[PDB]
């Protein structure tokens, strides 16, 4: 009977809530009340990139922290050199509606996807010298929202059919599928060890997935609206999420509960991108009101504002070495801050 | 080293030339989003002229690009934001049907979206012949679904085609007024709606969308100059 299972699920959720309450005595702000603030951060634009036509949805830093990639609605994929602002590759796209891109850790591949429900893999080390599509992954139902490389042969993708998938590039088959979300999965982030990955969906829930077994380990529910961005803490035992209720929240894998929220009265717009710094002390979050904000993760006090963007900020990324942070936006401009 | 910089500069120059050509091609075409329901009959409209379907048609040597929604889910909250730069949204609704209230709610949601505030909407009240024969039959009423239809009269500025009884003219103009009531509630000058009484097999739909796109572009240019 449906009623008995509904009641059992309700009491199980109540028990989980009671356990989480019992496993919490002091907040994050209550233990860091004595450390000194980082002070005001006067970051300013160092490079500006003006090669795109339409708005920008995604960008991914290379593991060398020098190369870059960007996707725009004019069906153009462009690879930049952040040091000299020189375009290296310009990849035309079969479908002009792309909502994500990813740059392979080895630097030999780049991926993109969007409303065509297909993830396209491009090889940059071709023998002919001309970049061409190598593999097309066409097993998803809804629009593809985010993709991340594990290695040159495995890529994990999250789509609008409320499922996340693990792909085998060589065969093209969908090796493992992840189910459980009741809404559009908007973004995902990979753990530093590439053993787990979290996903933020449109049902205001974040789930911790296990790549090897394919099951769901934990579910985090503290947000009020749909989640847009997600990113692991550099330690690997925490992550931050950004939703449309103008709040950034920090969760913990071990405590299985929320620790800190980053909200201000003057902020009533959505959040589109979230990223950390190398030490994890600074949390950077792009907002809808044309500017980004820098949050002191250990004190929840804003420490800087990056207000150089004309239109909505939609993508954000921090280099592996942490030297610079890049911020694309809907005005077809990428600005590298430092 | 100098040779590496020379190579990167040469590659950048070539890529910039190709991007200039792509910009010249891109600025010429106009993008249209074809939106509707299964009963709306938009498939017949597409036939007259995967995850997403696109069609290319030219009217007076002008390139238009129409993107059918395709095989997506029924939740349009997130992917509708990608179409905030299109010239217009071709909203196709079946006027013979409660699907009409659902279409009205969808139109209201589209019209009041923050990202879609600048985008204009072209309205096609399809299935006109079916509505005409249904009203002549009289088996199904509109007053029962819409209680306001009893106290509604045909507008004095209406221009019905000859040989058409007032019974269907009043009903179709009532539906058009119901849509325009949502249309004129907000969006004061930012964007406009263009209702058209289109049949399924009408050959003038291309002309209608052509003229509506021309009007939208003219009004945008006037708005930029603060002349409107």
């Amino acid at each position, epitope marked *: 009977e449906l009623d008995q299972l509904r009641q059992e699920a309700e009491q199980l959720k109540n028990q989980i809530r009671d356990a989480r309450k019992a496993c919490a005595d002091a907040t994050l702000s209550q233990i860091t009340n004595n450390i000194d603030p980082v002070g005001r951060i006067q970051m300013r634009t160092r490079r500006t990139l003006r090669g795109h036509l339409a708005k920008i949805y995604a960008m991914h830093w290379g593991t060398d922290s020098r190369l870059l990639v960007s996707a725009s609605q004019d069906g153009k994929l462009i690879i930049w050199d952040s040091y000299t602002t020189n375009k290296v590759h310009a990849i035309p796209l079969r479908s002009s509606w792309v909502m994500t891109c990813a740059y392979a850790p080895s630097g030999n591949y780049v991926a993109c996807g969007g409303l065509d429900n297909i993830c396209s893999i491009y090889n940059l080390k071709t023998r002919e010298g001309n970049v061409r599509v190598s593999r097309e992954l066409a097993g998803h139902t809804g629009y593809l929202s985010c993709c991340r490389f594990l290695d040159d042969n495995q890529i994990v993708t999250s789509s609008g059919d409320t499922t996340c998938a693990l792909w085998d590039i060589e065969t093209g088959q969908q090796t493992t599928t992840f189910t459980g979300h009741t809404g559009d999965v908007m973004s995902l982030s990979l753990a530093p060890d590439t053993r787990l990955f979290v996903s933020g969906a449109c049902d*205001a*829930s974040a789930k911790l997935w296990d790549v090897r077994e394919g099951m769901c380990r934990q579910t985090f529910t*503290g947000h*009020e609206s749909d989640i847009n961005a997600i990113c692991f803490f550099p330690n690997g035992n925490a992550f931050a999420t950004g939703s449309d209720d103008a709040t950034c929240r920090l969760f913990d894998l071990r405590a299985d509960q929320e620790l800190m929220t980053y909200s201000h009265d003057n902020i009533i717009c959505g959040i589109t991108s979230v990223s950390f710094s190398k030490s994890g002390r600074l949390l950077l979050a792009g907002y809808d009101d044309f500017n980004c904000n820098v949050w002191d993760a250990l004190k929840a006090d804003r420490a800087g504002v990056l207000a150089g963007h004309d239109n909505r900020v939609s993508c954000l990324g921090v280099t592996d070495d942490g030297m610079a942070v890049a911020t694309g936006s809907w005005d077809s401009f990428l600005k590298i801050w430092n | 080293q100098r040779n590496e910089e020379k190579a990167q500069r040469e590659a950048n120059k070539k890529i910039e030339k190709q991007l200039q050509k792509d910009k010249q091609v891109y600025r010429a075409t106009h993008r249209l989003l074809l939106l509707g329901a299964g009963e709306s009959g938009k498939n017949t409209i597409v036939k007259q002229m995967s995850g997403i379907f696109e069609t290319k048609f030219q009217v007076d040597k002008v390139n238009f690009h129409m993107f059918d929604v395709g095989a997506q889910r029924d939740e349009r*909250r997130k992917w509708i934001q990608c179409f905030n730069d299109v010239t217009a949204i071709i909203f196709v609704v079946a006027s013979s049907s409660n699907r009409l*209230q659902a279409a009205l709610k969808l139109f209201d949601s589209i019209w009041n*979206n923050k990202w879609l505030r600048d985008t204009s909407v072209i309205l096609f009240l399809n299935k006109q012949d079916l509505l005409a024969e249904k009203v002549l039959a009289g088996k199904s009423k509109i007053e029962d*679904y819409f*209680p*306001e239809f009893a106290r509604y009269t045909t507008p004095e500025d209406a221009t019905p085609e000859p040989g058409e009884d007032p019974r269907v003219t009043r009903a179709k103009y009532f539906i058009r007024d119901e849509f325009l009531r949502i249309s004129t509630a907000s969006g004061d000058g930012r964007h406009y709606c263009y209702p058209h009484f289109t049949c399924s097999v009408d050959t003038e739909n291309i002309r209608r969308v052509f003229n509506d796109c021309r009007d939208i572009i003219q009004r945008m240019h006037l708005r930029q100059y603060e002349l409107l």
Partner: nanobody
Framework: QVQLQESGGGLVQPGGSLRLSCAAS????????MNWVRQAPGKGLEWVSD????????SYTGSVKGRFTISRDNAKNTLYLQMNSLKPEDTAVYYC?????????????????????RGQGTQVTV
């Protein structure tokens, strides 16, 4: 998390009066537009009514105009629905859906299936 639970409903003879209450938890109830959605047996989801953040603007579907009234009190985080004359075709399941985003006028996907922010619903029969 977000939890919407409906109250009221049951079996009432035609012409009777019914009261529907929705209890909201897990979010600031004063920042979201609220909706009522009805699913007739054998048919799809149908929208019934909506009320603004402060209750200033109220809208109803045509079939129930002047017969159902909706109300909300932000202090108690409760959404109401008053029924006056249950016609025989009103038998269906009623959900108190929520507008997906705060401080906005557009409420997409409320009548769509498998919507995230919807209650279990109550069954009314006549």
């Amino acid at each position: 998390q977000v939890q919407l639970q409906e109250s009221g409903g049951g079996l009432v003879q035609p012409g009777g009066s019914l009261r529907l209450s929705c209890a909201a938890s897990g979010f600031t109830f004063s920042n979201y537009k609220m909706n009522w959605v009805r699913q007739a047996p054998g048919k799809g989801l149908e929208w019934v009514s909506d009320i603004s953040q402060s209750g200033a603007s109220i809208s109803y579907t045509g079939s129930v105009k002047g017969r159902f009234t909706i109300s909300r009190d932000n202090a108690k985080n409760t959404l109401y629905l008053q029924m006056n004359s249950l016609k025989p075709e009103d038998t269906a399941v009623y959900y108190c859906a929520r507008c997906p985003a705060p401080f906005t006028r557009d409420c997409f996907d409320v009548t769509s299936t498998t919507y995230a922010y919807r209650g279990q619903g109550t069954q009314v029969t006549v």
